[PDB]
């Protein structure tokens, strides 16, 4: 019998989703992942699955699926790919060249853009090196541009390593809030729980 549905319905529908420097890592397991329902969800704009096909995905068991959600601009969705550089690809979220999941994403310029000043998100414009594949840097220390100690100051040597977006409703596509959720798949030496409807 088809019971114990996945909590994916609670993931793809919310008000405040996440930021790119602090992205969720929901470990979903022990359910019949019906990816056919994930197709006829809200009108997504990207369902590029790199590893396998969604038709054959419903016939393969898995151990646990890592759902990672964030919000980026329109011209940045291209950077969420198995191997690519960018201000968001190597500083906030990087995917290895083995991603067996999907890059599901959709425009959300209906509830993530109000005309009051949207100083809510950030994208970590400053960094010291490229982030490890699937790494999250939840830090707020003032970025030090070398050659001088900084016990916390903002001028001419040390700046805020984060910068907020400027999402506004009266803009064009490309500068609009786009919610991107990736589903990393894995199979360790553990019994597979999530298989799919049979």
């Amino acid at each position, epitope marked *: 019998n088809i019971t114990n549905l996945c909590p994916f319905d609670e993931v793809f529908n919310a008000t405040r989703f996440a930021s790119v420097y602090a992205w969720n890592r929901k470990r979903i397991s022990n359910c019949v992942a019906d990816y056919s329902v994930l197709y*006829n969800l809200a*009108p*997504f*704009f*990207t*369902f*590029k*699955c790199y590893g396998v*096909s969604p*038709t054959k995905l419903n016939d393969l068991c898995f151990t646990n699926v890592y759902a990672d959600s964030f919000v980026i601009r*329109g*011209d940045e*969705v*291209r950077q969420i790919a198995p191997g690519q550089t960018g201000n968001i690809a190597d500083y906030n979220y990087k995917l290895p060249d083995d991603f067996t999941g999907c890059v599901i994403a959709w425009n959300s310029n209906k509830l993530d853009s109000k005309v009051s000043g949207n100083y809510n998100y950030l994208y970590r414009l400053f960094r010291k090196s490229n982030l490890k594949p699937f790494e999250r840097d939840i830090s707020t220390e003032i970025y030090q541009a070398g050659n001088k100690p900084c016990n916390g100051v903002a001028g001419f040597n040390c700046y805020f390593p984060l910068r907020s977006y400027s999402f506004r409703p009266t803009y*064009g*596509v*490309g500068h609009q809030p786009y919610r991107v959720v990736v589903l990393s798949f894995e199979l360790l030496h553990a019994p597979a729980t999530v298989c799919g409807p049979k």
Partner: single-chain antibody
Framework: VLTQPPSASGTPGQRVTISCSGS????????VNWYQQLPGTAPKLLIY???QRPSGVPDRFSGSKSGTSASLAISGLQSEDEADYYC??????????FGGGTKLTVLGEVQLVESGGGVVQPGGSLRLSCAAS????????MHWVRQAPGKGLEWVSV????????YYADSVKGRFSISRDDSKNSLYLQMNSLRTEDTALYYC????????????????????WGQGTTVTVSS
């Protein structure tokens, strides 16, 4: 490559089912699109995203994407549904492969006008112009879809709303240059190394997505087309 019934049939009152076969490289990883073209008039979008329809398309059309093949359905066809139906999908090899066309015959507001055709000397050619009127040109992409007289459709090139990455076909690669300039929402396509096998209409088609149809593999379609010029090189 897409397999499609070349010329099917049908009877009035009941329904038919036009199908389209494609490998997992184009349809299995993307979304199919069904376009309708009446004999004489410019083509128009019929079904996009495999389950959605534009505001102009009524409920008389339905689509399904079961597996690696697409299936169309026209519940209760009539004399008005006697037109050509084309399939189209973005293959993962940076190309836009179209169908062949289905002669489903049963015998019982923004203008996108373009110009720049005319018979020219072979080998060389001229530029292909295009225009519009107040439709937020920056927030949409443009395609070039040439169609030989009486033949089917095929994709030439695509320019995204950003104006950056662009993709060309397997035959028009290199010797073609597509660009956009936001003077009056124009589109310039320069052609080189003419082989006289280009006698078509060269529709300057409008889309609805913003980026190149390789990152947005679920919304890419084609909005209201424009009356293209009959360019007949003929050497």
């Amino acid at each position: 490559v897409l397999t499609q019934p070349p010329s099917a049939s049908g009877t009035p009152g009941q329904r038919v089912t036009i199908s389209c076969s494609g490998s997992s490289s184009n349809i299995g990883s993307n979304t199919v699109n069904w376009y309708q073209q009446l004999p004489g008039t410019a083509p128009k979008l019929l079904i996009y995203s495999n389950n959605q329809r534009p505001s102009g398309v009524p409920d008389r059309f339905s689509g399904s994407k079961s597996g690696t093949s697409a299936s169309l359905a026209i519940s209760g066809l009539q004399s008005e549904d006697e037109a050509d139906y084309y399939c189209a999908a973005w293959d993962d090899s940076l190309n836009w492969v179209f169908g062949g066309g289905t002669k489903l015959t049963v015998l019982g507001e923004v203008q996108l006008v373009e110009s720049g055709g005319g018979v020219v000397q072979p080998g060389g050619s001229l530029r292909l112009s295009c225009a519009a009127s107040g439709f937020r040109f920056d927030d949409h992409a443009m395609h070039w879809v040439r169609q030989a007289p009486g033949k089917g459709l095929e994709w030439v090139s695509v320019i995204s709303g950003d104006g950056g990455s662009t993709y060309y076909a397997d035959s028009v690669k290199g010797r073609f240059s597509i660009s956009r300039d936001d003077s009056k929402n124009s589109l310039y396509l320069q052609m080189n190394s003419l082989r006289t096998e280009d006698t078509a209409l060269y529709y300057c088609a409008k889309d609805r997505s913003y980026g190149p149809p390789d990152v947005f593999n679920y919304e890419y379609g084609m909005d209201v087309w424009g009356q293209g010029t009959t360019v007949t090189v003929s050497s």
